[PDB]
Design a protein around this motif. Sequence first.
Motif, PDB file in Angstrom:
ATOM      1  N   UNK A   1      22.866  42.405  11.519  1.00 12.33           N
ATOM      2  CA  UNK A   1      21.687  41.704  11.019  1.00 12.33           C
ATOM      3  C   UNK A   1      20.541  41.777  12.015  1.00 12.33           C
ATOM      4  N   UNK A   2      20.842  41.668  13.308  1.00 12.20           N
ATOM      5  CA  UNK A   2      19.783  41.638  14.309  1.00 12.20           C
ATOM      6  C   UNK A   2      18.981  42.930  14.300  1.00 12.20           C
TER       7      UNK A   2
ATOM      8  N   UNK B   1      16.740  43.535  10.957  1.00 16.54           N
ATOM      9  CA  UNK B   1      15.561  42.715  10.716  1.00 16.54           C
ATOM     10  C   UNK B   1      14.660  42.562  11.928  1.00 16.54           C
ATOM     11  N   UNK B   2      15.220  42.400  13.119  1.00 17.65           N
ATOM     12  CA  UNK B   2      14.418  42.155  14.300  1.00 17.65           C
ATOM     13  C   UNK B   2      14.790  43.063  15.449  1.00 17.65           C
TER      14      UNK B   2
ATOM     15  N   UNK C   1      25.689  37.675  18.683  1.00 14.75           N
ATOM     16  CA  UNK C   1      24.902  36.676  17.946  1.00 14.75           C
ATOM     17  C   UNK C   1      25.737  35.665  17.190  1.00 14.75           C
ATOM     18  N   UNK C   2      27.059  35.820  17.149  1.00 10.67           N
ATOM     19  CA  UNK C   2      27.922  34.936  16.383  1.00 10.67           C
ATOM     20  C   UNK C   2      28.982  34.245  17.220  1.00 10.67           C
TER      21      UNK C   2
ATOM     22  N   UNK D   1      16.703  35.236  15.212  1.00 14.29           N
ATOM     23  CA  UNK D   1      17.331  36.390  15.840  1.00 14.29           C
ATOM     24  C   UNK D   1      17.130  36.280  17.340  1.00 14.29           C
ATOM     25  N   UNK D   2      18.222  36.362  18.088  1.00 16.56           N
ATOM     26  CA  UNK D   2      18.222  35.914  19.465  1.00 16.56           C
ATOM     27  C   UNK D   2      18.498  34.428  19.499  1.00 16.56           C
TER      28      UNK D   2
ATOM     29  N   UNK E   1      19.797  30.841  19.587  1.00 15.15           N
ATOM     30  CA  UNK E   1      21.135  30.273  19.637  1.00 15.15           C
ATOM     31  C   UNK E   1      22.106  31.052  18.761  1.00 15.15           C
ATOM     32  N   UNK E   2      23.382  31.000  19.142  1.00 13.64           N
ATOM     33  CA  UNK E   2      24.432  31.603  18.334  1.00 13.64           C
ATOM     34  C   UNK E   2      24.364  31.048  16.920  1.00 13.64           C
ATOM     35  N   UNK E   3      24.661  31.897  15.946  1.00 17.53           N
ATOM     36  CA  UNK E   3      24.525  31.503  14.558  1.00 17.53           C
ATOM     37  C   UNK E   3      25.581  30.468  14.185  1.00 17.53           C
ATOM     38  N   UNK E   4      25.301  29.626  13.197  1.00 16.85           N
ATOM     39  CA  UNK E   4      26.295  28.642  12.770  1.00 16.85           C
ATOM     40  C   UNK E   4      27.427  29.298  11.996  1.00 16.85           C
ATOM     41  N   UNK E   5      28.522  28.553  11.859  1.00 15.11           N
ATOM     42  CA  UNK E   5      29.678  29.020  11.097  1.00 15.11           C
ATOM     43  C   UNK E   5      29.414  28.733   9.622  1.00 15.11           C
TER      44      UNK E   5
END
Lengths: 102, 67, 118, 233, 57
Positions: A33-34, A37-38, A65-66, D15-16, D18-22
């Motif tokens: 995704x990163x 899009x960006x 990122x996850x 994007x960048x 914080x880490x994404x939520x679950x």
Amino acid sequence: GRVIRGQRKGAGSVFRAHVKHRKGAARLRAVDFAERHGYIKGIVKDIIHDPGRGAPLAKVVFRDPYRFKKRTELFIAAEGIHTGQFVYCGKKAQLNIGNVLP
Amino acid sequence: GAYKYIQELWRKKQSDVMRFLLRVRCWQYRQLSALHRAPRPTRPDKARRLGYKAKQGYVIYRIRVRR
Amino acid sequence: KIRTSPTFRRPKTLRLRRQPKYPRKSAPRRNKLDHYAIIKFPLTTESAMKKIEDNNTLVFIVDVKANKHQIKQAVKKLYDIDVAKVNTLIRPDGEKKAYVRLAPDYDALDVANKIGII
Amino acid sequence: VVNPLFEKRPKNFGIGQDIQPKRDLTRFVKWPRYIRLQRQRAILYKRLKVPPAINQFTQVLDRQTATQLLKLAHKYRPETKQEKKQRLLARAEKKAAKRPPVLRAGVNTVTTLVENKKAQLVVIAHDVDPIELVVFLPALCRKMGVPYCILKGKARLGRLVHRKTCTTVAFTQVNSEDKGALAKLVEAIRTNYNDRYDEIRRHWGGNVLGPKSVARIAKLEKAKAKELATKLG
Amino acid sequence: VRPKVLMRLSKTKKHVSRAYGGSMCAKCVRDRIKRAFLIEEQKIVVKVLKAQAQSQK
RNA sequence: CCCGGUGAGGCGGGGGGGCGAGCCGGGCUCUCGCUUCUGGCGCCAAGCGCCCGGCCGGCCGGGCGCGACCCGCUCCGGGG
RNA sequence: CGCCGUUCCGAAGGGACGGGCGAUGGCCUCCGUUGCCCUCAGCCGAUCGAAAGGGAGUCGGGUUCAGAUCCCCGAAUCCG
Ligand SMILES: [Mg+2]
Ligand SMILES: [Mg+2]
Ligand SMILES: [Mg+2]
Ligand SMILES: [Mg+2]
């Protein structure tokens, strides 16, 4: 007649690649995704010699990122990049040497 | 006497109905392993006239062989 | 309710313990390596005598399958003595020799007379 | 009174940052092969062209008619094993000191009854598989003038006969007090199925593209329409 | 010492009394405190101008 | 049917919000989705709303929702 | 008969701090154990492959016809 040397190369055996001391496969990031899009930032940790390859390889590190992890990528080293440099991969990365853009 | 209609139906293998069933079933059979335990006979009438009985101890297996 | 992971894993399902209707073996097999089996006979050579007199050590031929713990427990039960340690080797003819040392409160020379070695 | 220490600590999920939520990944899960297979088979039945003989079974009763049809059928369920023993024992004492109406179950038993015109109403499960077991029954019932209907669930017809599943059931006789109820059900069922049979057997199914494809075509045309609309303004 | 000999050494012999002690050199620990602080300040500087510029906007 | 990638992690459509354009404050043309100075750090929720429990309005302990938009039929692409 | 293949077309985890429900026990006081539930979980490849590679920790003296860093004497050490 007998099988010629060219024929014998395709059977593996004594004709396989010497990959004992190679550092891994040099690839870009797996598109996510990163990069769709960006952009994502990464830092060049080391530039290493790869046996059997003329070009050096860069060891870039990104943030996952996850998850709470560091990802180590093995890029082809574009000429002019140095350790400690920031590289950016994605659709909105800026046109700089070492950046990965569509 | 439904087994009579089904038998005649499975003789019209080039009819629109049976062509559709054979095509999707072949697709479904192609996503499975070359040997596969089948829960019940796909062709109950054809199976029984070959000796199959719908009682415990009889089992069905679907086998895929390269043409 | 939701899946926070793109992976699908086999769920854990109940696993029952065995509850046989019958035992496969009617009775347990008898122990074939009891104490009388482990100790075959005592060694009486010139060097075995030296072991008894100088090193407070008895020398036995034992079953090759027996281990040091088994030999030690067999020696104590058979002759009602205490054992300090056991050293073992397998002889070139296949027999297993055990160098059994007794506790300081025991006299191997006296114990040998009880056993009949001396 | 509010503690001055307490504060907001928002997370920035750009994007960048914080880490994404679950979040819910249900749509992107890699499912077992068997799950992928049965879902891709449901998409094919929509994507392909389904012949009317197979597609006629997608047309079914509404809940309200099926509820009435199932409540009437509930009054003629075959006697269970346990309650047949009582019936037999009650006969033994009867000896020492008629057949009521009942549902007829099974595609083989119903087929013979329809051929003989001894059935008054035939109910066919909509999800018989292999479909060949009943793909002919709607046409057969129509030929003999036996009203038929298609019900959702071979398992519902299964619960009627106290079995896991049943392809089809048939009414042959009803009690006098229930003759009116059957006449009402037959009339509604006859119009939907037996009377429309000419159009049912020409009505193909499926042949519907996926949502992403449809949206893609709709967008492509809307550019033409707006371009066409902007042609004159 | 060899890696498995560290098991029987006490903690004091394996680290230093300082943040990251025994894993990061002092020289680069001084540099991360400055970098972490100095970079965090620039965010506020940038953020203030962003809001201040937006305020006028 | 085939190929590539991925720990099949944000696809399609709509909603909602920001910067510009423009007709006589509202609608649209239509774009964007918050990371580029530094060889730092970054998960295991803050906050808010609503319910419930234990002890004597006060202490102790939980649940749900938003935060983290909604609906969808192929994981995402490339072929065919 | 089998062969190819070793992560590649796989529902590939039988685990864990913590919490909740019971069943039992014992220095029955209160702590264990156990079963289920909740929660959390990348490693992604069964297994084999070196008496010269990696791999904690034993040295001195005496002793036999033939063994000793292995026996005896003395002094230590690693691991659990
Ligand atoms: Mg090994
Ligand atoms: Mg070795
Ligand atoms: Mg070695
Ligand atoms: Mg020693």
